[PDB]
Symmetry: D2
Subunit: 246 residues, 4 copies
């Protein structure tokens, strides 16, 4: 049998606020594999919520940081450097779009809402990748989350679809720029884990079912682990084959 | 023989600052096909340059407006509605990224610069599309410019590549939202208008701005009435190559 | 006002057997534009049908040739060379898959049926492009038809989907090899032309199906000098249907 | 730590003729994970070579079968069924194009050569998938190999690029048709690797140097990296993945200028 032993490896998981999320599933698999995890949380008032996530994982180091504040991101990574000495994996599970932008039509998106969605959902990957670069050890990597709406029109996804398109293009450019130092950058396009798409996916996908957060966690583990050492700049789909359907 | 007659059609061309540009090329072809053109210009201090452009087109209305200012965009379309009564075509040739963003690596892009690039290069399509919607007549259309860097890594294009990815995704969503009312939205992915491109491209030469202008005219004309949400490449076939 | 004048231009249109074909729509637009057209017909027993098509176009030269027979393709282009002196456009509207292959599942396609579909639907472009190469003048081009099932799974299309995937990849490699001499090669991915039609209309951004004229116009454009900078491209004329990630 | 234990799993690996091949690499990782492997070999005169391969894998059943012969493929699967009772994985590493087709221009490909390339390289996936269907258990899967040339033009790959385009479309359709029964179908798009198969592609050496100098990782991948991706896709870790073409090419394909 094969064994994936990530003991000694260090991971920073961002944008997670609940145990029922893609970001937490990846963190859980990373911990199961033996890696030590650090979780960022947006504001001090969210510390207790983060603490519960840390406990659910069986232990994790916490750091406060709002991804829209460069000063706080600097603090976060100085903190990660001091506590871990370096970094191996970075899980980017940050995503946000104002409610106003998500209600209605994409064409009606307000300037401020559009920019905030792009800033938090796409630019944040750039912001953290740059600060993680000095800490990332050879064989390390960054993995983010995306969705099919980035390439095809999925009604009611609006600016998030555009943000994910920006995120995926960012993944390619970051893979190119961080690749020479042995750091890989990939995106995971997950299927649904609303009821509109969710139910239709189970009916139309080749596997005739929706994926689970564990299946995303498993792909995240694979992509970050040395087993995926030759894979970078990729957008890998774990959607039960839904996206290949016409 | 066949003819494309755009007599009576009205076009708003934005982002044009030079005669040697893709946006101008499209405006020129629309004019040749018989349509009337209105050119937007960014600041009043650029009025003289704008007037030279209008004159080079054989006449064009001019409207001042900076796409980062919603109030100016409102004024732009109020003026277009008053002068034209309606609108048939909108040519979005707006593209910009702060110099600092284009210098160095993409990973080093500063927050403010990154957002300004996306705001001017991608969101602007949304901003103008929303304002053009009420004015656009049936058979109307919106065309924008893009580059293949949106899908493949082209070193040094940096944030502009990401902006184009956002632009192309916006084209698809806008095609979906404006299509029911008969408005088409498409993007033109043009090659450079360098020597490496000529050596690698199937046609072994670079495209000309006229070739981009012709594709723009086609997409906007009723000849392409069944086409929307597309990114059409006019690059002498360069992007199909997996090497060189 | 702009004008497209293809008088003096020569086009060979293949795979057309009816006025409702996309190939006929393109031929009609080319003729309307001023070009002279040549139509191939598979066998003498189909000569009557070809003659009606020629008449429907307002006049056209006919040539017999089955695309699975190299000698007949050799005779076709020898005939085209003699009657036209050269060639400007080649419209490949050939498509076929044995009914057995189209009934049931793709996984159950029989060996001979699978190969015949690929041979007629994809290899034929290579075969005709090779023979047209010596005749195609600068600024000339080849355009073929395809469907999005080549990239997305459209049940029931079965082997034709795979054939179209092969056709599109062939279009790219041919664009690469014929491009240095001024020949353009592109594909047109058309949507359905009219229950099934209602579904497409409901999901397509334009909320309607495309017309055969819309395919004809894209074919005219791509072959015309207006598209001189375009090659190796697969252009969709489907009312935006394929951009939708979910049926409406 | 985590473990991928495939003990009791049965795999049929086809198209392998040398230890320096992507197909062998996947079979090796499968064996290392605990799976039992059966290798097909094209002709009885290659039995000695096949035996050396089996030995190198630490043991593996051998079955003679040429993918262009339906009766032989029937006997192959009848044999696999008799020996394994069922099947979990099918690795399709079969690829072939006549030398004449590969030498010269794609536009000059002869009819018979073109059809043979497509028949062996693409149709074979369909032929073996159909026969494997009744033998494949839930959680089962089929994985095949492909490369960038299928989507973008790489000089000198000629008909193989076309065959891979057909192979990839076949993967999507087979994923759709076998998915209901819990069987997954995926393709691995590998970057250049010094293999016996690569020698048969005139446009390989060109690609090989290019990748190392142009890919984000600034190096070529190894067959082991392809082997690992194959193991992953076939294992339960990839249970939600199907109809996908996964690139393991050091990021080369995302590059433009």
């Amino acid at each position: 049998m094969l064994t994936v032993d990530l003991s000694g490896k260090k991971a920073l998981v961002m944008g997670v606020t609940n145990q029922r999320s893609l970001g937490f599933a990846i963190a859980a698999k990373l911990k199961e594999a033996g890696a030590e995890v650090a979780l960022s949380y947006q504001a001090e008032r969210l510390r207790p919520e983060a603490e519960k996530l840390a406990e659910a994982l069986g232990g994790a180091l916490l750091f406060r940081a709002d991804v829209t504040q460069d000063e706080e991101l600097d603090a976060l990574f100085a903190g990660v450097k001091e506590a871990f000495g370096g970094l191996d994996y970075l899980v980017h599970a940050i995503a946000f779009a104002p409610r106003e932008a998500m209600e209605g039509r994409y064409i009606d998106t307000r300037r401020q809402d559009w920019l905030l969605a792009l800033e938090v959902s796409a630019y944040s990957l750039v912001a953290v990748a740059r600060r993680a670069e000095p800490l990332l050890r050879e064989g390390g990597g960054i993995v983010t989350l995306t969705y099919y709406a980035s390439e095809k029109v999925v009604p009611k996804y609006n600016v998030m679809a555009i943000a994910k398109a920006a995120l995926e293009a960012s993944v390619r450019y970051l893979a190119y720029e961080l690749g020479p130092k042995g750091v890989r950058v990939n995106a995971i396009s997950a299927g649904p884990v609303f009821t509109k798409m969710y139910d239709r996916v189970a009916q139309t996908a080749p596997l005739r079912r929706n994926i689970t957060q564990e299946e995303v966690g498993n792909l995240g583990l694979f992509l970050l682990s040395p087993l995926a050492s030759g894979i970078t700049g990729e957008v890998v789909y774990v959607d039960a084959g839904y996206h290949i359907m016409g």
